[PDB]
């Protein structure tokens, strides 16, 4: 459907991006943590754009009641389809995001305590905005130049990445799981009305084809008689 | 089936899996073990939302008794094939992450004895927390400087994790033997009524189809015939 | 449709384009933001040449009143449509060059704190004149001898060009969806006018085919006998 | 069909398991000779779980007599088909571990004599714990020093092990052929009251098909007569 | 189309082509820019050949009034529509020669101010005659021996061939834009005609076709019963 | 055939053997003939496993007289070509085997005279023990120190192979051709009493299908109506 | 045909052979010339193995006079027809071992003249023994010392095998081609008696297949109804 | 047909033929010249020998006149189709040989100056027998010391080597033009009853195959009945 080819294009995404962490302390969180939040708004309002039942929605909430074809309880059972079909991009893109850890490397490197991981006597002659900056370069491969402390911190920032993104994966599964336990008696068989107006919608444009084209007919021959000199018809007459 | 998929999916999803098991001894437990524990719970609700007749299990248990259509020994039995259906991806994360020993290997490295695999005079003269520093970054394999009393003891724990990755697939699969030989008496036939229900659920959403889209086709033509002043139908009008 | 070939077409030129940034202060900004910028207009102007519906508007547009075939809010109608298809390869230019940020390398290079990102005493000794010349260099990987300096500087400008990509991807994906909740009341079912005109052109040019090729069948037969003394007709008769 | 499926998993189980022995001497024996066993017992338990008659085999002992379908020498004969259809994937397995001698050089190079292969003042000068402690590394090719003695001793057992290989397959080929010699008269004709009662079941369940999916159909018209306030039926009312 | 296969063809001979830029002052003008417009009126040329019905406007404008099959006017349009059909495989050359940068390079490099790029000492001590050879050589590759001058050198020269590149698509596309808002009042639905007489060529010669083959079965049957004696007919003879 | 893909897995099973030839005097001998004989032996028996016809054939030979459907003559006609049909599989080892040359050189390497190939002055000074260890590594390529006089003996050892090779090849095609001009009057056309007897079972178990799957289709119905109180049948009627 | 599968074969098992030429005088001669014939004398009987007629051949040559089917001079055409087919296969052989030439330089380097190539100093010093030891090693690549006097005399000896070849498949042809110019003399028109038998064995062995699955069908029938109760026909009654 | 694919494979002889030109003066010109006139006339002779209708031509020169079926007018014209058909395979072998230029340069190059091409005292010093052996080596590429008097050499009789082969292309294709000016009018239409006897001969042979076919029905069903005791016909007696 439309959210197999976003949970897809989303992993691709990730995959195609070259990440460029900065490494700079003002600049590192804004990166690291707007690169896990600004693409999920991204693929959230992509899921209302391609999901054409919105503009339908759209022109339902302009009119005033009484000519409104649905009830606020159906309008609102299409927001709440549209919305959590729209939400498998972002945790797509969320949890891949956190199993690679890239994002929380570049993020939380400078709130590391360096003693942990290796040679204390790094850090000891630096003032604290050296001490940031030292800090800060920890996800920029080739601006690091201690291979040890590296290694152990951005093994230790991929496994908090990771315990992360498995608690958000089961975060999600079990919301997901306690709405197919509950949302179908929140729609109550409402969805009936909601795929008889979807039917009629459908066959009405439709039926807007044939009738227009059988009048696309009739002003075509007289056309044609009045183009050449002639008025001609093959089995096109077979509506006509 | 689902079911096939989702054993293929554990299985691909440990070979794409980077495992990055920190070195710390406080954190290596909770990664290692968490990581042969939590999936399972993943692949389970995965195993219930993925499986739609658990929506009407949901709404068979949510109305009081009289109206409800099964008896409750036949609700337990969609129960019952609704779960040992979903546990083979479970099961397959199991076994594969214990044949391969990557998560008895981040876990269980600070329990070692290390004078058995090589020089003791490695830990004479440390203390015990560094003790445990020393042995615990033995997974890590780009942090430990020893070269063989780190693949004498990555063979050790890949050894004892792979006699416990049989002897789970050998009482995982003793125990679905003994449901093959027990639980055709616990279902009694009752399968049929539940079929019978699977076919009428079935059929009653496409005579809803076949009848919306009839009342569709009527709704259509008067709304055409007030679009531009035409009312057209093809073989549409077959069911018309 | 075209404008997913020209979506592919877009993103494809810009893998095959070869990024030839000059490296002299006058000559960057005009080449950076150049391309930033007269690519699109030319996919844009592409994207009214392939699209045959213009030389429809523009003949409309052409006639006097009394003569013209739509109201002005129709002929407006196929100007919007025409438009909001055609920002489609734009706007994957825009966003892919922002992405991969070499063109806010380019141009931006010269605007840069070298102090920031290295050795300060690279600029004390030269005047204004070399101190840009020195910095317009950054882009250009093999005139540039610094290279700590060099992959500090690509990384922050390949940084805020990727973070002025995503803020374009939100106001392009934020404008759109406001366009899929408004414009279906600016069109207001007039695009049943506009498909019955689109019908009409499209069955006239089909029978002026028809009595054209009935109308040459007459004068092949009568041109025929004359050729060598000899009328002769296969089920070419059929339409005689 | 099923069992040449068990033979090519059998087979390619063994190919990508990763033989990981230890080297100690109390854990030699056990992972050496307990891998040349336990695959076999999970592949036979396998072959029941996947063979369904089974299902069939265990009800039919579940009731007393006089209700049973078949007579105790038809319920013998389904015990041995099931058993020799299930003796491929074991003996497929065991007969790919002997030829390689992987497991028999895991378990037994620590009952070699190190005089026949090459230097014994590699022994002497070692107390018998220190004896058992470098024969039993042979198997682990990069925790041994010596290649000379090395590739001696698992040429040796790799020798010794397909002559079990072959003394193996020749005497389950003679086995099968005893079989096909003399199990004929075992059955007696039998399998024609089991083919009878194979179609017997198997056309007792398509006719409940077809039974319960007209019965959908009468309870699904009453059911959309009262859903909408329409019953409709195609060529569904063809079973109706 | 015809069209399609030319740009294909257009951009495939660049790629085919050798580059073999000669490094003398008075060859280089002549080769370099030749190349930018010699193939043009090649490929123009090519699709004039290629048009057949540049064949047809050729008797028609050989005969005298009178006799002529057009107006004036429509013996015009089918100048202006092979003309603006043929301009796309010079459009690919020259917007393809300009994006690589590789013929203003050759061409405008005796025209450089080496003062700009590099080393100024490596032209003090020359000629005005051996200037022009030292500066003549730099798109020669491996005939120049600075590498810093050559890469600044070529990168100025590619960058300005390549913003003449995107001005020529530029106006290229802004042209014919204007004449999908011009030109279809210029044809004034004379396309008919054209498309009529057309049409009556394509069948007259399918009509002497029939008629020459229905005469050659008349002249066959009379020379076969003249040349073994025997006359003789199939379904050849259901023309007949 | 089922002798056309045991002649293709013969000689596959060589190629994907891996020989191991001790190196020892004593396991020499037995390894490289016993490689030479019991996988002949092996393919034999598997060459009357799955030839179904020795089933028949067990069954008429347990039998007494007077009920035997065949001659003694005609069931000694079936053990004649159920041999010389099995006897591909040894044949394709065993010249396989001899035009490879390692069983021959394992086999017969401790039998040399190492003074025609070479130094002489290696075994003086070795006991006639010595000798043999001496001699009996030349198949072990990785244990043998001289690799001049080991490619001289295994080059004639692997000639003396390769002339067995054809002299075998010469003298089974020399026998296959004996009895393709002898054994014609063996059988004496008693095939046909064969092939009579072999469509007499196979229509026999046929005409067991279409009747007990009727006598199914009887009792399918009875049980079905007391199923959920439903009789219903297709199509399937057809042969009730 | 069989005849382009053999000569297909025979030159692939040449390039599946590897040649392995003894270095000693007594066994170069008989391995090189014994690989030039011995494998055309397989490849000819294995022609006449695999063509069947002569298993017709051969029992009419068993009968006495007077009931045997064919003229002498019939049998002797039918001797004449599967020589001369059954002659590719060993000429294949022949000409791809003499153009290759290594068959020629096994056998034939222990007659040179070791002074027309190279060092006479290499073979002044050693007696006529060790004259043939040093001439024979010749073929042997990784035995001979000099790679002068090798590939000078394996150049000589390959070409004097590929002008040997070549006047081989001339008098092969010429002589092929004497016998599409005599033996359809020989032939004399009685290939049609040839055929005509050819035609009344196969009819007669098919005739013998519908006959005798019809006595099949009357047994079967009578054996069903025996079976289990019941006599069952479908359209295989249509025979009956 | 035959001629396209025997062009096809005496142009894949030559590049699978491997060159192996002695370096011998008495030896170079019969090999040299000689792979260029024996392989002609082996794929002369080869282009009778597959053209069956040198069979139908043998026979038809043996009978006495009278009886004689042609012309031999017409017997010639088959001499010279067959002829002319078959010079195709013998001229693109000394074509491609003559591109190629190593049979000249093997033939000729006893024949060299070899003041000409470089050092004039490589020569100066030996006697005309070592003269020769000197100037024959030069096709031998590791055989030959100098590798500028070898590479000067071989480039000169590779080029003459090529003229020659042009003129000969040249004064193949002028000779094959005459022929298609001439010989229509040696013909003088008397293909025609060749292609009566062709389809006389053809059609001949399968009313022989139907009429024999049916001869072997009437045989078939008398030996049928013979046979069990019965005699079965299936539409196989609709020719009966």
């Not at 707007?34 to 302009?62: Q, R």
């Amino acid at each position: 459907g439309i959210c197999g080819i976003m949970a897809l294009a989303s992993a691709q995404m990730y995959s195609s991006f070259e990440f460029s962490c900065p490494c700079m302390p003002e600049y590192n969180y804004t990166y690291g943590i707007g690169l896990l939040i600004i693409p999920p708004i991204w693929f959230f309002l992509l899921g209302f754009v391609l999901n054409n039942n919105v503009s339908v929605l759209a022109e339902e909430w302009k009119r005033p009641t009484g000519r409104r074809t649905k009830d606020p309880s159906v309008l609102r059972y299409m927001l709440c389809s549209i919305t959590q079909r729209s939400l498998i991009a972002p945790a797509v893109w969320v949890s891949v995001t956190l199993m690679d850890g890239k994002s929380f490397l570049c993020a939380f490197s400078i709130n590391l305590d360096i003693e942990k991981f290796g040679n204390a006597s790094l850090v000891i002659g630096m003032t604290e905005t050296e001490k940031l900056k030292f800090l800060a370069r920890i996800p920029c491969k080739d601006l690091f130049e201690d291979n040890e402390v590296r290694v152990a911190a951005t093994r230790y920032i991929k496994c908090i990445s990771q315990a992360c993104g498995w608690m958000f994966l089961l975060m999600m599964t079990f919301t997901a799981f306690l709405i197919r336990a509950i949302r179908p008696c929140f729609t109550q068989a409402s969805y009936r009305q909601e795929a008889y107006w979807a039917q009629y919608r459908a066959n009405e444009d439709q039926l807007f084809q044939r009738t227009a084209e059988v009048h696309s007919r009739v002003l075509a021959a007289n056309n044609v008689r009045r183009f050449f000199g002639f008025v001609a018809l093959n089995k096109d007459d077979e509506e006509l």
